[PDB]
């Protein structure tokens, strides 16, 4: 864990927008 | 255009001098103090000083004040913007910014002075990237420097592509004494630690209001920031073509990306604050504060700075929820709060005694200063799409991010 | 005290020595160094200033330092005086007008209390042409048998090929070492 | 004391001469008339390590306009370094012939000055494009002289970015005065 929200994974790339 | 950088003490000694064109003579430091001194004296005090035809310029730092003396119309903003960097490499090389390591590390500093700035015209402001030809503990220049891309060293392996952002929110309210809030801007600030193997090139990707009516998808919930200032890694082009960001993120911790937007929003906490001040017998403070943001989201640290009487002495509080300490240092109520669930309503009754003598002059009115921070809420709605990490090599990139809430210039103007 | 290093040291070579370098400009000093150091005939500008170089042969580190022969430059020489052990003299045969200059340079760098244990160090520079004399005639016109407790020594040497060059290095090892 | 420190100074052990060099920077920096121990200093300034050579330029640079005529023994030790092999200590060596205020010592500066005007090191090209802005600022006839204007023009339309920037920026400053 981690004080100010936990980290979370991000994406790559709008993968609905092509 | 500076002439000579030079670096004063608290007492007005001049720890270190780096002259850089040399048409101002070195005794004009001098009578930089006194004219410093009947500046602020006299309310005239002002970081651009002037000793006859030589302008000394300078910012305030922890410990001295790096003034750099000019003789002619030379660059405010440059000689400004050089001694941020300056400090900036500072701090990267030394954890702290104080005396001890001026008379300590001079060694690397007169090298790190004379590599980064010839005849007043800086050329090099990448610690990382100076790091690796000036230490205080040499090769030949990095290729980085000589090559466009100044800011990714090339050759850097680790054993895992692991980058940690930081979406961190700053709740800047300006509520008058009448009750309204004037000023509401929130700065958005993506700071990410990257921290990968070769020269990475970024694709950030967001749900940007301009994005979204662009690409057709202008329904959803998109950040519409005012202003948005991308990092040097940041090709300014590819955002000016199709809001495309698109850069090589540095090796560290660096800000790639600041949105700065208003806010029309009620604010996240609502303070209800009675003044019951007796004519030199007693006071009473009814604070009130009513918690205005998400129940699901929760205020860590919650340092709502009441200011008190000066001469205010033996108080007592009556509070209902978080710690109230008054600090003689800063003259003021702190209402210091743990965990603040949204939507949560503390009451405080203050009653502390006053002097029979009047004070002999007035001491204004300062402002009440909520210090909430709560991570994992994201007021402005903005959330990170995807983040193209593609690599020559080719390798499979872990990005992290994390989003943090904190009151900005959260103050609330006196009644 | 123990000497017992010091014995050690001296049992495979210790001592070191020291070498100087002054004369007139165009003398073939800087060539001179260049194949002491090196082996090969260096083409270089004028020396403004001066050359540091260190020589090693016969376990002894012979460090030369070149001094130009600049008339802003002659009354330098007094600066490398201190800290001084040895001295060598290049003369240039080749500048018939020269030569009285070169020669009262030389009798005013001798006329020095401070340098008094530096022997002479005569080197007979550009020794390819015709018209440079023997190692007799220019040691006779500039005096040299004249310069009472000074050990002088005339040497030719050819720059463009280095002949005489380890006579030369042998009879300053003899002249500076007086051991085995 | 300086006496002790011209004799260390004076030593043939660079572990003392290392020493020496940071002590006599410090009492420059702390406040100390330094500058009657120059020529002293002057000897020892051709050395092998980097670290020994930049505290002596800096001394020279700072020691410059006090002691111009004891200045004169070191054109010949900017020479020799103007062509090292490594492009840092040819760019030192361009920044500190720049910074020399010695109308005597410019002169003699202009040969590598443009032997640096077309190295093929970008640092040692930024380095160059400075000291020509600095010559003209100290002298403008000598750099009208030594046709550096075309040279600098050339600049903006090579390679080298960084380069490119720096040329423009002492191109800017010499038509400024
Ligand atoms: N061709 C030829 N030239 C020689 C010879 N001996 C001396 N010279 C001349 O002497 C000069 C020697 O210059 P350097 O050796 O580089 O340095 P230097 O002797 O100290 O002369 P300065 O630098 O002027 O003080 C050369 O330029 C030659 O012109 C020789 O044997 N052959
Ligand atoms: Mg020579």
Redesign the interface.
């Known amino acids: 864990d981690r004080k100010g929200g936990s980290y979370s994974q991000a994406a790559g790339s709008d993968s609905a927008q092509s | 255009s500076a002439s000579a950088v030079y670096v004063l003490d608290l007492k007005g000694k001049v720890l270190i001098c780096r002259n850089y064109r040399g048409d101002v003579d070195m005794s004009e430091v001098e009578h930089f103090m006194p004219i410093l001194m009947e500046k602020e004296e006299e309310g005239m005090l002002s970081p651009i000083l002037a000793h006859g035809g030589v302008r000394f310029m300078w910012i305030k730092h922890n410990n001295l004040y790096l003034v750099a003396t000019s003789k002619k119309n030379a660059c405010v903003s440059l000689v400004f913007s050089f001694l941020y960097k300056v400090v900036q490499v500072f701090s990267e090389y030394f954890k702290e910014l104080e005396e001890e390591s001026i008379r300590d590390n001079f060694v690397i500093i007169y090298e790190l002075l004379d590599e980064l700035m010839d005849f007043g015209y800086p050329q090099t402001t990448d610690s990382k990237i100076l790091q690796e030809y000036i230490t205080q503990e040499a090769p030949r220049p990095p290729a980085t420097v000589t090559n466009a891309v100044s800011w990714r060293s090339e050759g850097i392996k680790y054993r895992k592509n692991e980058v940690f952002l930081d979406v961190i929110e700053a709740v800047n309210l300006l509520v008058s004494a009448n009750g309204n809030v004037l000023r509401s801007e929130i700065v958005g600030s993506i700071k990410m630690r990257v921290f990968l193997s070769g020269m990475p090139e970024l694709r950030l990707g967001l749900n940007d209001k301009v994005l979204f009516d662009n690409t057709g998808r202008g329904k959803s919930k998109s950040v519409e920031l005012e202003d948005v200032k991308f990092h040097q890694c940041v090709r300014l082009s590819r955002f000016e073509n199709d809001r495309t960001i698109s850069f090589i993120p540095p090796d560290g911790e660096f800000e790639l990306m600041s949105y700065r937007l208003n806010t029309h929003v009620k604010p996240l906490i609502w303070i209800e604050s009675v003044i019951e001040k007796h004519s030199h017998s007693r006071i009473e403070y009814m604070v009130k504060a009513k918690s205005q943001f998400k129940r699901r989201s929760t205020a860590n640290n919650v340092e709502i700075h009441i200011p008190v009487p000066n001469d205010a002495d033996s108080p007592k509080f009556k509070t209902t929820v978080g710690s109230v300490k008054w600090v003689p240092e800063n003259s003021e109520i702190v209402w210091s709060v743990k965990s603040f669930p949204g939507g949560k309503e503390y009451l405080m009754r203050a009653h502390f005694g006053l002097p029979s003598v009047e004070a002999e002059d007035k001491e204004g009115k300062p402002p009440i200063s909520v210090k909430f921070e709560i991570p994992y809420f994201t007021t402005s709605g903005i959330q990170v799409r995807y983040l193209k990490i593609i690599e020559k090599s080719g390798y499979q990139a872990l990005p992290w991010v994390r989003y943090i809430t904190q009151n900005g210039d959260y103050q609330l103007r006196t009644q | 005290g123990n000497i017992f290093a010091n014995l050690f040291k001296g049992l495979f070579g210790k001592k070191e020595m020291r070498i100087l370098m002054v004369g007139l400009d165009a003398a073939g000093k800087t060539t001179i160094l260049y194949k002491l150091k090196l082996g090969e005939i260096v083409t270089t ?1 004028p ?6 170089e260190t020589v090693e042969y016969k376990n002894i580190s012979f460090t030369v330092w070149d001094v ?1 022969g600049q008339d ?1 430059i002659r009354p ?1 020489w007094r ?2 005086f ?2 001084t052990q040895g001295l060598i003299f290049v003369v240039d045969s080749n500048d018939r007008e020269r030569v009285n200059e070169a020669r009262e340079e030389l009798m005013r760098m001798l006329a020095e209390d401070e340098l008094r244990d530096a022997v002479l160090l005569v080197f007979a520079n550009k020794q390819d042409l015709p018209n440079a004399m023997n190692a007799a005639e220019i040691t006779d016109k500039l005096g040299l048998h004249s310069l009472r407790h000074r050990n002088w020594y005339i040497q030719a040497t050819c720059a463009t090929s280095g002949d005489g060059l380890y006579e030369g290095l042998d009879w300053l090892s003899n002249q500076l070492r007086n051991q085995k | 004391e300086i006496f002790e420190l011209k004799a260390e100074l ?1 030593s043939d052990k660079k572990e003392k001469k290392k020493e020496a060099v940071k002590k006599v920077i410090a009492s420059m920096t702390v406040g100390k008339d330094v500058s009657a121990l120059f ?1 002293d200093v ?2 020892c300034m ?1 050395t092998d390590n980097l670290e020994l050579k930049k505290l002596v330029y800096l001394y020279l640079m700072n020691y410059a306009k006090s002691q111009p005529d004891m200045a ?6 900017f ?1 020799k370094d103007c062509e090292d092999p490594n492009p840092l200590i040819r760019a030192l060596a361009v920044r500190t012939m720049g910074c020399i205020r010695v109308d005597k010592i410019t002169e ?1 500066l202009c040969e590598p000055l443009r032997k640096c005007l077309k190295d093929e090191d970008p640092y040692v090209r930024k380095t160059a494009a400075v000291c020509v802005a600095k010559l003209h600022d100290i002298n403008a006839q000598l750099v009208e002289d030594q046709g550096f204007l075309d040279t600098l023009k050339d600049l903006i339309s090579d390679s080298n970015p960084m380069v490119v920037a720096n040329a423009v920026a002492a191109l800017s400053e010499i038509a400024e005065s």
């Open positions: 500008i020396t403004i200033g001066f050359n540091v130009g802003k330098l600066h490398y201190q800290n | 004076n020529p002057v000897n051709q004169i023994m070191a054109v010949n030790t020479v003699y």
